[PDB]
């Protein structure tokens, strides 16, 4: 039923680690303040994406047991989850309640940021499907940790070692879904299912960047490593 003292410790630790991120208000205020050209927005995106990866690495290093893993598996986990984690955080930022008309303006600004038409609909469809889950901050934090500690990633040598670390996070998340939404017993399974939708949506991350309506696509060396761009 209830979280154990050890689970409460794990939860507050994950929350404290997760909260070292930029506040959604910092991101949405920037986009809502004024309209920018496609060229300016591409630079805002690359800056934000670089900060997101740097913050993600710090969050990952704090995940209990992560630093006990094989060094090559550590790289495989971070490389395998970095883009999915950015899109999950983007969904969280998009679903944060704002004053009347602001979320509609935010959507319209992002639609006109320079991102190609073919990536627009799948992107906002994913954000709105996440939004329907009505996730709490604890659910986003645990779900991000669960995404990172995915045992089924390509190139992982010791899957069981990763399973052992993901298992207590899944147990805590399941308990919280039962507490936050007792009326909806499908809540937990729905969260897990959206993670598969996140993987599929992530297949074109490199192209979402390369097809941005700008004459030149300049990337930081860290972004090139993470997003598979040159």
């Amino acid at each position: 039923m209830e979280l154990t003292p050890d689970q409460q410790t794990l939860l507050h630790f994950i929350m404290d680690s997760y909260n070292k991120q930029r506040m959604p208000q910092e991101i949405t205020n920037k986009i809502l303040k004024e309209a920018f050209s496609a060229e300016e927005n591409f630079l805002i995106l690359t800056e934000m994406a670089t900060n997101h990866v740097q913050v993600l690495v710090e969050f990952t290093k704090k995940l209990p047991g992560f630093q006990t893993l094989d060094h090559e598996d550590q790289i495989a986990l971070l490389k395998g989850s970095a883009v999915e984690a950015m899109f999950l955080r983007s969904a969280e930022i998009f679903n944060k309640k704002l004053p009347s008309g602001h979320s509609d303006l935010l959507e319209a600004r992002i639609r006109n940021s320079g991102i190609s038409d073919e990536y627009i609909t799948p992107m906002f469809s994913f954000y709105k499907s996440i939004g329907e889950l009505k996730m709490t901050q604890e659910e986003y934090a645990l779900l991000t940790a669960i995404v990172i500690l995915s045992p089924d990633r390509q190139y992982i040598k010791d899957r069981e070692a990763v399973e052992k670390l993901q298992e207590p996070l899944l147990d805590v998340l399941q308990k919280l879904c039962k507490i936050h939404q007792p009326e909806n017993p499908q809540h937990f399974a729905c969260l897990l299912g959206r993670l598969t939708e996140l993987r599929t949506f992530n297949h074109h991350h490199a192209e979402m960047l390369m097809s941005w309506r700008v004459n030149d696509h300049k990337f930081t060396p860290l972004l090139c490593e993470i997003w598979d761009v040159q």
Partner: peptide, 12 residues
């Protein structure tokens, strides 16, 4: 090669 990723993971 993930050189920068490896560096960020192995530091501190």
């Amino acid at each position: 090669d993930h050189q920068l990723l490896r560096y960020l993971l192995d530091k501190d």
